[PDB]
Design an enzyme around this catalytic site. Structure first.
Site, PDB file in Angstrom:
ATOM      1  N   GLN A 193      25.787   7.655  -0.299  1.00  0.00           N
ATOM      2  CA  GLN A 193      25.663   6.198  -0.517  1.00  0.00           C
ATOM      3  C   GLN A 193      24.208   5.765  -0.349  1.00  0.00           C
ATOM      4  N   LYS A 195      22.415  19.355  -4.475  1.00  0.00           N
ATOM      5  CA  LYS A 195      23.476  19.172  -3.496  1.00  0.00           C
ATOM      6  C   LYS A 195      22.953  19.413  -2.072  1.00  0.00           C
ATOM      7  N   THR A 213     -13.121   2.749 -19.919  1.00  0.00           N
ATOM      8  CA  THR A 213     -12.099   3.551 -20.585  1.00  0.00           C
ATOM      9  C   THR A 213     -12.555   3.822 -22.015  1.00  0.00           C
ATOM     10  N   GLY A 241      12.698  15.374  -2.830  1.00  0.00           N
ATOM     11  CA  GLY A 241      12.426  16.022  -1.538  1.00  0.00           C
ATOM     12  C   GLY A 241      11.120  16.813  -1.636  1.00  0.00           C
ATOM     13  N   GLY A 242      11.141  17.971  -1.004  1.00  0.00           N
ATOM     14  CA  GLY A 242      10.038  18.912  -0.927  1.00  0.00           C
ATOM     15  C   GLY A 242       9.415  19.216  -2.280  1.00  0.00           C
ATOM     16  N   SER A 275     -13.301  -7.898 -10.534  1.00  0.00           N
ATOM     17  CA  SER A 275     -12.387  -9.027 -10.374  1.00  0.00           C
ATOM     18  C   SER A 275     -13.069 -10.350 -10.718  1.00  0.00           C
ATOM     19  N   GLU A 313      -7.152  -4.407 -14.978  1.00  0.00           N
ATOM     20  CA  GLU A 313      -6.717  -5.550 -15.778  1.00  0.00           C
ATOM     21  C   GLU A 313      -6.053  -6.610 -14.927  1.00  0.00           C
ATOM     22  N   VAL A 352     -16.674  -5.003 -19.493  1.00  0.00           N
ATOM     23  CA  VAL A 352     -16.854  -6.247 -18.737  1.00  0.00           C
ATOM     24  C   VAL A 352     -17.336  -5.892 -17.323  1.00  0.00           C
TER      25      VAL A 352
HETATM   26  C1  LIG Z   1      -9.096   3.821 -13.903  1.00  0.00           C
HETATM   27  C2  LIG Z   1      -9.776   2.496 -14.202  1.00  0.00           C
HETATM   28  C3  LIG Z   1      -9.984   2.102 -15.537  1.00  0.00           C
HETATM   29  C4  LIG Z   1     -10.609   0.887 -15.815  1.00  0.00           C
HETATM   30  N1  LIG Z   1     -10.808   0.544 -17.112  1.00  0.00           N
HETATM   31  C5  LIG Z   1     -11.614  -0.575 -17.405  1.00  0.00           C
HETATM   32  C6  LIG Z   1     -12.062  -0.827 -18.767  1.00  0.00           C
HETATM   33  O1  LIG Z   1     -11.742  -0.142 -19.709  1.00  0.00           O
HETATM   34  N2  LIG Z   1     -12.885  -1.917 -18.969  1.00  0.00           N
HETATM   35  C7  LIG Z   1     -13.296  -2.729 -17.927  1.00  0.00           C
HETATM   36  O2  LIG Z   1     -14.014  -3.692 -18.140  1.00  0.00           O
HETATM   37  N3  LIG Z   1     -12.893  -2.456 -16.646  1.00  0.00           N
HETATM   38  C8  LIG Z   1     -12.068  -1.413 -16.364  1.00  0.00           C
HETATM   39  N4  LIG Z   1     -11.656  -1.153 -15.062  1.00  0.00           N
HETATM   40  C9  LIG Z   1     -12.060  -1.971 -13.904  1.00  0.00           C
HETATM   41  C10 LIG Z   1     -11.117  -3.031 -13.420  1.00  0.00           C
HETATM   42  O3  LIG Z   1     -11.256  -4.178 -14.283  1.00  0.00           O
HETATM   43  C11 LIG Z   1     -11.436  -3.382 -11.979  1.00  0.00           C
HETATM   44  O4  LIG Z   1     -11.386  -2.140 -11.218  1.00  0.00           O
HETATM   45  C12 LIG Z   1     -10.478  -4.366 -11.337  1.00  0.00           C
HETATM   46  O5  LIG Z   1     -10.653  -5.652 -11.992  1.00  0.00           O
HETATM   47  C13 LIG Z   1     -10.886  -4.578  -9.891  1.00  0.00           C
HETATM   48  O6  LIG Z   1     -12.259  -5.028  -9.637  1.00  0.00           O
HETATM   49  P1  LIG Z   1     -13.132  -4.158  -8.595  1.00  0.00           P
HETATM   50  O7  LIG Z   1     -12.840  -2.733  -8.872  1.00  0.00           O
HETATM   51  O8  LIG Z   1     -14.516  -4.641  -8.669  1.00  0.00           O
HETATM   52  O9  LIG Z   1     -12.520  -4.516  -7.167  1.00  0.00           O
HETATM   53  P2  LIG Z   1     -13.019  -5.788  -6.357  1.00  0.00           P
HETATM   54  O10 LIG Z   1     -13.126  -6.946  -7.270  1.00  0.00           O
HETATM   55  O11 LIG Z   1     -14.230  -5.401  -5.587  1.00  0.00           O
HETATM   56  O12 LIG Z   1     -11.882  -6.162  -5.304  1.00  0.00           O
HETATM   57  C14 LIG Z   1     -11.605  -5.399  -4.139  1.00  0.00           C
HETATM   58  C15 LIG Z   1     -10.221  -5.790  -3.632  1.00  0.00           C
HETATM   59  O13 LIG Z   1     -10.288  -7.164  -3.157  1.00  0.00           O
HETATM   60  C16 LIG Z   1      -9.374  -7.979  -3.843  1.00  0.00           C
HETATM   61  N5  LIG Z   1     -10.009  -9.264  -4.114  1.00  0.00           N
HETATM   62  C17 LIG Z   1     -11.167  -9.561  -4.777  1.00  0.00           C
HETATM   63  N6  LIG Z   1     -11.433 -10.839  -4.855  1.00  0.00           N
HETATM   64  C18 LIG Z   1     -10.373 -11.437  -4.197  1.00  0.00           C
HETATM   65  C19 LIG Z   1     -10.065 -12.789  -3.935  1.00  0.00           C
HETATM   66  N7  LIG Z   1     -10.836 -13.815  -4.322  1.00  0.00           N
HETATM   67  N8  LIG Z   1      -8.934 -13.044  -3.243  1.00  0.00           N
HETATM   68  C20 LIG Z   1      -8.171 -12.016  -2.858  1.00  0.00           C
HETATM   69  N9  LIG Z   1      -8.356 -10.710  -3.046  1.00  0.00           N
HETATM   70  C21 LIG Z   1      -9.489 -10.485  -3.730  1.00  0.00           C
HETATM   71  C22 LIG Z   1      -8.999  -7.222  -5.113  1.00  0.00           C
HETATM   72  O14 LIG Z   1      -7.697  -7.550  -5.533  1.00  0.00           O
HETATM   73  C23 LIG Z   1      -9.125  -5.763  -4.685  1.00  0.00           C
HETATM   74  O15 LIG Z   1      -7.905  -5.269  -4.151  1.00  0.00           O
HETATM   75  C24 LIG Z   1     -11.023   0.058 -14.723  1.00  0.00           C
HETATM   76  C25 LIG Z   1     -10.797   0.454 -13.404  1.00  0.00           C
HETATM   77  C26 LIG Z   1     -10.185   1.661 -13.140  1.00  0.00           C
HETATM   78  C27 LIG Z   1      -9.943   2.096 -11.707  1.00  0.00           C
HETATM   79  C1  LIG Z   2      32.485 -19.707   1.615  1.00  0.00           C
HETATM   80  C2  LIG Z   2      33.357 -18.625   1.007  1.00  0.00           C
HETATM   81  C3  LIG Z   2      34.126 -18.895  -0.136  1.00  0.00           C
HETATM   82  C4  LIG Z   2      34.921 -17.895  -0.699  1.00  0.00           C
HETATM   83  N1  LIG Z   2      35.657 -18.186  -1.794  1.00  0.00           N
HETATM   84  C5  LIG Z   2      36.578 -17.237  -2.285  1.00  0.00           C
HETATM   85  C6  LIG Z   2      37.490 -17.598  -3.359  1.00  0.00           C
HETATM   86  O1  LIG Z   2      37.489 -18.686  -3.884  1.00  0.00           O
HETATM   87  N2  LIG Z   2      38.376 -16.626  -3.789  1.00  0.00           N
HETATM   88  C7  LIG Z   2      38.414 -15.367  -3.211  1.00  0.00           C
HETATM   89  O2  LIG Z   2      39.222 -14.546  -3.625  1.00  0.00           O
HETATM   90  N3  LIG Z   2      37.557 -15.043  -2.188  1.00  0.00           N
HETATM   91  C8  LIG Z   2      36.651 -15.950  -1.713  1.00  0.00           C
HETATM   92  N4  LIG Z   2      35.778 -15.640  -0.676  1.00  0.00           N
HETATM   93  C9  LIG Z   2      35.750 -14.328   0.004  1.00  0.00           C
HETATM   94  C10 LIG Z   2      34.638 -13.401  -0.375  1.00  0.00           C
HETATM   95  O3  LIG Z   2      34.741 -13.033  -1.753  1.00  0.00           O
HETATM   96  C11 LIG Z   2      34.633 -12.204   0.556  1.00  0.00           C
HETATM   97  O4  LIG Z   2      34.201 -12.732   1.843  1.00  0.00           O
HETATM   98  C12 LIG Z   2      33.661 -11.122   0.106  1.00  0.00           C
HETATM   99  O5  LIG Z   2      34.341 -10.386  -0.942  1.00  0.00           O
HETATM  100  C13 LIG Z   2      33.421 -10.146   1.241  1.00  0.00           C
HETATM  101  O6  LIG Z   2      34.579  -9.582   1.878  1.00  0.00           O
HETATM  102  P1  LIG Z   2      34.908  -9.698   3.432  1.00  0.00           P
HETATM  103  O7  LIG Z   2      34.672 -11.062   3.921  1.00  0.00           O
HETATM  104  O8  LIG Z   2      36.287  -9.135   3.592  1.00  0.00           O
HETATM  105  O9  LIG Z   2      33.887  -8.714   4.140  1.00  0.00           O
HETATM  106  P2  LIG Z   2      34.108  -7.143   4.181  1.00  0.00           P
HETATM  107  O10 LIG Z   2      34.632  -6.684   2.875  1.00  0.00           O
HETATM  108  O11 LIG Z   2      34.889  -6.813   5.398  1.00  0.00           O
HETATM  109  O12 LIG Z   2      32.660  -6.487   4.346  1.00  0.00           O
HETATM  110  C14 LIG Z   2      31.926  -6.544   5.555  1.00  0.00           C
HETATM  111  C15 LIG Z   2      30.534  -5.986   5.355  1.00  0.00           C
HETATM  112  O13 LIG Z   2      30.602  -4.568   5.065  1.00  0.00           O
HETATM  113  C16 LIG Z   2      30.065  -4.308   3.785  1.00  0.00           C
HETATM  114  N5  LIG Z   2      30.902  -3.334   3.094  1.00  0.00           N
HETATM  115  C17 LIG Z   2      32.243  -3.338   2.816  1.00  0.00           C
HETATM  116  N6  LIG Z   2      32.660  -2.282   2.165  1.00  0.00           N
HETATM  117  C18 LIG Z   2      31.515  -1.516   2.007  1.00  0.00           C
HETATM  118  C19 LIG Z   2      31.284  -0.275   1.387  1.00  0.00           C
HETATM  119  N7  LIG Z   2      32.246   0.440   0.797  1.00  0.00           N
HETATM  120  N8  LIG Z   2      30.023   0.201   1.388  1.00  0.00           N
HETATM  121  C20 LIG Z   2      29.059  -0.524   1.973  1.00  0.00           C
HETATM  122  N9  LIG Z   2      29.151  -1.704   2.583  1.00  0.00           N
HETATM  123  C21 LIG Z   2      30.418  -2.152   2.563  1.00  0.00           C
HETATM  124  C22 LIG Z   2      30.014  -5.649   3.042  1.00  0.00           C
HETATM  125  O14 LIG Z   2      28.905  -5.629   2.154  1.00  0.00           O
HETATM  126  C23 LIG Z   2      29.738  -6.609   4.208  1.00  0.00           C
HETATM  127  O15 LIG Z   2      28.334  -6.534   4.526  1.00  0.00           O
HETATM  128  C24 LIG Z   2      34.947 -16.605  -0.077  1.00  0.00           C
HETATM  129  C25 LIG Z   2      34.180 -16.354   1.059  1.00  0.00           C
HETATM  130  C26 LIG Z   2      33.392 -17.344   1.600  1.00  0.00           C
HETATM  131  C27 LIG Z   2      32.561 -17.062   2.842  1.00  0.00           C
END
Ligand SMILES: Cc1cc2nc3c(=O)[nH]c(=O)nc-3n(C[C@H](O)[C@H](O)[C@H](O)COP(=O)(O)OP(=O)(O)OC[C@H]3O[C@@H](n4cnc5c(N)ncnc54)[C@H](O)[C@@H]3O)c2cc1C
Ligand SMILES: Cc1cc2nc3c(=O)[nH]c(=O)nc-3n(C[C@H](O)[C@H](O)[C@H](O)COP(=O)(O)OP(=O)(O)OC[C@H]3O[C@@H](n4cnc5c(N)ncnc54)[C@H](O)[C@@H]3O)c2cc1C
Ligand SMILES: Cc1cc2nc3c(=O)[nH]c(=O)nc-3n(C[C@H](O)[C@H](O)[C@H](O)COP(=O)(O)OP(=O)(O)OC[C@H]3O[C@@H](n4cnc5c(N)ncnc54)[C@H](O)[C@@H]3O)c2cc1C
Ligand SMILES: Cc1cc2nc3c(=O)[nH]c(=O)nc-3n(C[C@H](O)[C@H](O)[C@H](O)COP(=O)(O)OP(=O)(O)OC[C@H]3O[C@@H](n4cnc5c(N)ncnc54)[C@H](O)[C@@H]3O)c2cc1C
Lengths: 385, 385, 385, 385
Positions: free
Chosen positions: C282, C272, C158, C342-343, C132, C366, C125
């Site tokens: 965390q 580790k 392709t 990482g690295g 596009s 596509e 196509v």
């Molecule tokens: C590895 C690979 C395999 C492929 N395989 C096939 C295949 O088997 N058969 C086939 O037919 N084709 C295939 N394609 C082509 C694919 O269909 C097109 O690359 C894709 O549709 C994007 O069109 P374009 O490359 O002309 O980019 P363009 O259409 O030139 O767009 C450029 C950028 O502008 C954005 N853009 C364009 N128009 C608008 C708009 N109106 N509003 C907002 N953003 C817009 C696009 O999202 C894009 O990010 C393949 C392409 C690749 C890279």
């Molecule tokens: C409108 C409303 C209605 C409610 N209704 C009920 C009900 O019917 N019954 C009931 O039992 N409870 C109810 N709750 C309480 C609600 O479940 C608790 O507010 C909720 O569990 C959060 O605990 P907290 O308020 O003690 O905040 P905290 O536990 O003190 O947490 C504070 C902040 O630290 C973050 N945090 C805490 N521990 C960690 C951790 N280990 N790691 C990472 N981030 C952490 C939390 O995500 C939050 O962003 C209600 C609360 C509200 C506001």
């Protein structure tokens, strides 16, 4: 060469802002979130301490602080409450336009007063039908002699009901095919002008102490002298504004993120489960680390964007990256903060769930997450030209 | 005050590195990746251009460049090929220990001859049984008169079979209950010393032109004169080395990431699908935006860490953030670049699949991804005490 | 009701496939990756064991297995080597079209032979200019009496150089404004037809034992009898094909993912560091858990998509979700597998870096990752109608 | 053979639950979220419709439904409101222990009266000092003749102040070196028993209409007749309870996620920006696609886990995967739904912000997100032995 060292003057603003945030905001922030009262007393303080209207030039009794400076202050404030802070910030939002597109008379008039009393102002662009699409607004501005008649409706206006004056963007070219660069006009509108119908205070999920309102404009008459640069120059003013304002909004998101982190760390170093401190569970220590990673990155980004504009260059690209990045990780940290707090995190008696509520607007207001990508893509690509 | 402005001196190293990288490395990097052949000619040339052994103090005939400069240069070289660049990097890995823990006598002889000829050196710590767990190495050093006898095996040694001399970390305290802080000794071991058995060239997924080998030490006699600071000061030298080395490895990563971004952008602005350029499909524009975002964030991180150490302060926290973040985004970007290329990207005749293979080591060597979170967490918690 | 229990017949195919993969593929897979030889002997086996051309109806000496069945077999095979498996899969890719759009004569002719000798086929196509965008292909099919003259070039085929016959999609309606639903025709082309110029074997990053080639078609004459359903029905055939083929390609990605997991678990339960097993950190135990989570989810998704088509219903929505999900987590597990090693993971003497190389095409061929979202969005939204 | 087909009996429970949820719950869920008021009328109605206490064996007048049925029903109720649904769920949490560790006498009396009236019950395990660490509870039980004396405090108890009776887990072995497996006892404690001090209603971020409370037990006398299987069989009963309970909590999550998806889709197909529907911006279409993907994946996970237990096999591994995955995607989807809505989403007059507040508990209650990875890891490694 490179330097990430604050100046002595900066260190002192920072200290002042930090003390205010930790000693005055924090202990009262929780209550204002619950009540949603306008934090008048907090604001009266902010003003007195000179942590408000910092961008107002010295010639109008301002401190004439830079964008780096404001960012620095903002971050500290935001840390306390972004509800309160956003109110302060909204003042800057309405001021900047006047600062980069107004004349002496206008500035001296409207900026000057801000410097005398703890007055508030606002920034009216957004309408029910258009937020993201600025060029899509329909608030009409019709020339009639030496006045302009304003008819339209604005939505989500911060300080909307507490503002003394509004920056207002309206469509002045009825031609639907007129370019955005010529179709709009920026006006200064005193809030007590007949036709100005201020709506109710809106109830949102977060930053609930902030005043957010809807305002209707019915045959609002505005003196020609209130046109910022001239007819059609509204779009330029709006855009130019962002370069200066975006970095500070990013900073505010960082302060929130930083708050979240601090609180999560405190708790993780207290609470015990399975015989170990939360911070001793590798699972948790890794969470906290990723949290810390993001705060530092976000802080760097606004700094970069701020230095740029302060250096007198369009910082659109960098500014947009900061707002976008800061906004996303403010949201991630907020939810991760609630997580380490466990059950207590979901409870209203702990300071984190509020953080989770507040953080969400950062991905919406002043250029949504998506719009930010649009801007970055444009600025990025533009460079391959 | 903040500054993200390069010095005039920095601007020319950067230009030198940028010209060499994209006019000499790039054109042949693919053929070196295919063959695995050691790129002696490039190294030779790199030495002449003064883009090697960059940290060697002037007294010893070096340039005496700071970490910032290294990063600046590194990032340009990396752009070309990380295969080539790691060869260069290895030299610095071997030199730092000497520079921070060697006497004038040691430095003059060992650093001095690097400046005279295009010699190579290596850093030997990792062993078949321990890499992440440095305190778990087992290559023993026994004091026999005015000499030491080395017995052990080292694995994954860059420039292993091409080094004039090695920095070698061995356990000098047989008591298994001896504090890591006192159980090791750093050595400068000459490759030609009777008893060093240089293994085969390891065949890896990426950075294939880089010489990586296992080395065995059989009753290797090292003059006590070759001991760095003294017996037991091994651990301190190794740990202190990363402060200066971490930033530059991070720069290599955002180098390979910048390459990924560039290629991807170039193609997106050339290839058409559904009647539009790839860049014109919001899905792609968004991808490119995110990619862009990450490169910039990573860049700022290793600058922040570099400045810090140059300022004469321990940068462990910042250096860990940078190494960790840059390594990750290097990997995400490489896969996203292959993605933008579609089917051509998976093809060996295009420059991005190689990038994908290369980028993976950044998450492994010089403190794995996991190890980094351990450091960050440890450093961050410290701040809450 | 629900049932996640295999039938006796299925358990037996599965066992047969598993034994073959673990006892015959695995021990030889590494060498074929290095050499890139066509795995002829492996294929001759697959055939004999009946793990090839499973969808061919019984009437043509096939087993007439379902989509669930093939998925089951595929997963086992893929586990061994997706290089080998993709070769087998490509047979199904070229067969399905004939199965859903051919006549008795055609099937008996071309499917029958597959059942007699261990022959291969392919699916053409994709072209250099369109992958596009299927509707964007330009391989021309011109009617001339009782024959069709094919002139075009195909890419990334392709089995391209090892195929006996090709399914070939060509544009038969010269009208540029003709709908995709009527502009194309599907043909069966014997590979030994004059005009068929098979290109060199392409060298790709992964699945290197697979035969991927470029094919040119110069005045290739094809008998009218080789038209699958009729002129203009090519697009319908192509699309219908995916419903049946997508689930099996997803399965293959799962087998890869499963391989990665197995290998990482083995190693994590051996190695580790810091006095504990890798699995005792965390940090690592959490990685492994997330790894396990994804494998199980991906397996479920192809099962769901497969059951659906086997039930005789369009499974586009589910199929597209499986391919998309399986492809992404095959890539995530591959890189996480190299990580726990990482690295050693980066080294060619361990089985994981290959996994990392292979997995990448899953996000491309596509239906790329992006195209999948397009399809899901369309099918999803369509449901709100 | 595989089957993802519901029985005719299942189809009608599903229809009953779906009608009730979207015709009764939905219309009032917002007003309940605002007030916090216990939704007695809905519960009352839910009981009459037979959508409560669903697991109670027929002998005791119950329906004797399996875990699959529960999940099916659960998911529909959840769609409406998880606030309401958790109230329902709590009942089952309290019942299971009894059903798997109670004698006929105990079941008849305690399960039996649930079937007669619209009664509620609760599950008491968590304590102010231990939630995740069940083996760390401290509410002691002392055998005094033919009775037990309970002393302790329990926190975060759903239906805490609305329960007729509680399942209570207490430490019966004072030896701190006693195996968890032998140190606890399960009890059925009647709420009216002298000594139970029901705390205040806790105010949480979400699920605000759900009754959550702290409870204190002061010299509470419990007849030895109320001991479930025997002294020391506490842990086994609690752990065994999750096998049956985990799947259904997972279903609630993909219920709240299905709601998020629906709303988001509805809006995207209505709202316009930049002259197009939201759904027409590839950035949004892609978002919706990913959202869709996740819901389906989560659904399949709790089916797999449900079938398994119904088949009479321990499903810990599968149930953990499901609870963990569903909880996460519930959270991602809720935030993405708010996102699609823009500024309206942050507003309290729209249905998604509530969803965002609600979804968070899934990552906390009934085994936190972290705890789940512990279980999974433990279960997965087991398979490599
Ligand atoms: C590895 C690979 C395999 C492929 N395989 C096939 C295949 O088997 N058969 C086939 O037919 N084709 C295939 N394609 C082509 C694919 O269909 C097109 O690359 C894709 O549709 C994007 O069109 P374009 O490359 O002309 O980019 P363009 O259409 O030139 O767009 C450029 C950028 O502008 C954005 N853009 C364009 N128009 C608008 C708009 N109106 N509003 C907002 N953003 C817009 C696009 O999202 C894009 O990010 C393949 C392409 C690749 C890279
Ligand atoms: C409108 C409303 C209605 C409610 N209704 C009920 C009900 O019917 N019954 C009931 O039992 N409870 C109810 N709750 C309480 C609600 O479940 C608790 O507010 C909720 O569990 C959060 O605990 P907290 O308020 O003690 O905040 P905290 O536990 O003190 O947490 C504070 C902040 O630290 C973050 N945090 C805490 N521990 C960690 C951790 N280990 N790691 C990472 N981030 C952490 C939390 O995500 C939050 O962003 C209600 C609360 C509200 C506001
Ligand atoms: C609390 C609050 C305070 C505010 N304060 C002010 C203020 O003081 N002054 C003021 O003028 N405004 C203010 N705003 C409004 C803010 O500017 C808008 O909410 C924001 O720009 C989003 O526009 P919208 O709400 O119309 O969402 P929409 O524009 O309708 O967008 C809906 C969703 O679709 C996405 N989207 C839209 N267009 C596209 C596209 N082309 N491609 C991809 N995705 C797209 C958006 O990112 C968003 O997620 C405030 C809003 C809030 C919630
Ligand atoms: C191409 C290449 C070049 C190299 N060059 C050099 C060189 O010049 N000089 C030199 O001395 N070394 C060199 N190395 C070795 C490299 O530094 C080590 O590979 C790296 O330190 C990882 O150690 P490892 O390979 O022993 O993996 P391991 O330490 O065994 O780790 C395996 C996995 O478990 C994780 N892990 C280990 N301990 C923990 C823990 N406590 N908690 C959580 N996760 C953990 C790791 O993150 C990794 O994912 C090189 C390696 C390569 C591949």
């Amino acid at each position: 060469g490179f330097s990430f060292e604050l100046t002595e003057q900066q260190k002192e603003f920072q200290a002042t802002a930090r003390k205010f945030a930790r000693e005055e905001i924090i202990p009262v922030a929780a209550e204002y979130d619950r009540t949603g009262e306008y934090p008048v007393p907090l604001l009266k303080r902010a003003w007195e301490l000179g942590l408000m209207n910092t961008h107002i030039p010295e010639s109008f009794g301002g401190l004439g602080l830079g964008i780096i400076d404001s960012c620095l202050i903002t971050e500290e404030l935001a840390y306390g409450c972004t509800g309160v802070q956003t109110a302060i910030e909204a003042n800057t939002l309405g001021q900047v336009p006047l600062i980069i597109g107004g004349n002496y008379q206008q500035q001296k008039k409207y900026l000057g007063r801000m410097t005398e009393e703890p007055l508030m102002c606002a920034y009216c662009v957004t309408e029910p039908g258009a937020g993201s699409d600025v060029a899509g607004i329909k608030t009409k501005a019709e020339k009639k002699g030496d006045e302009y008649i304003i008819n339209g409706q604005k939505m989500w206006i911060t300080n909307g009901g507490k503002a003394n004056w509004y920056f207002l963007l309206a469509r002045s070219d009825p031609d639907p095919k007129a370019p955005a660069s010529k179709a709009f006009t920026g006006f200064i509108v005193e809030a007590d002008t007949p036709g100005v119908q201020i709506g109710r205070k809106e109830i949102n999920m977060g930053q609930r102490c902030s005043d957010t309102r809807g305002i209707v404009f019915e045959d609002v008459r505005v003196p020609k002298e209130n046109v910022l640069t001239g007819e059609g120059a509204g779009f330029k003013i709006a855009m130019g504004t962002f370069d200066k304002t975006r970095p500070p909004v990013a900073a505010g998101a960082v302060g929130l993120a930083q708050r979240a982190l601090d609180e999560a760390t405190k708790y993780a170093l207290e609470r015990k489960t399975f015989g170990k401190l939360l911070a001793e569970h590798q699972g948790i220590s890794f969470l906290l680390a990723d949290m810390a990673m993001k705060v530092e990155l976000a802080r760097l980004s606004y700094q970069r964007a701020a230095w740029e504009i302060d250096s007198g260059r369009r910082n659109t690209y960098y500014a947009s990256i900061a707002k976008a990045y800061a906004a996303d990780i403010a949201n991630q940290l907020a939810t991760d903060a609630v997580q380490v707090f466990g059950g207590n995190g979901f409870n209203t008696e702990y300071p984190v769930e509020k953080l989770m509520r507040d953080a969400k607007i950062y991905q919406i207001y002043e250029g949504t997450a998506q719009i930010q990508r649009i801007i970055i893509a444009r600025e990025h690509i533009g460079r391959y030209k």
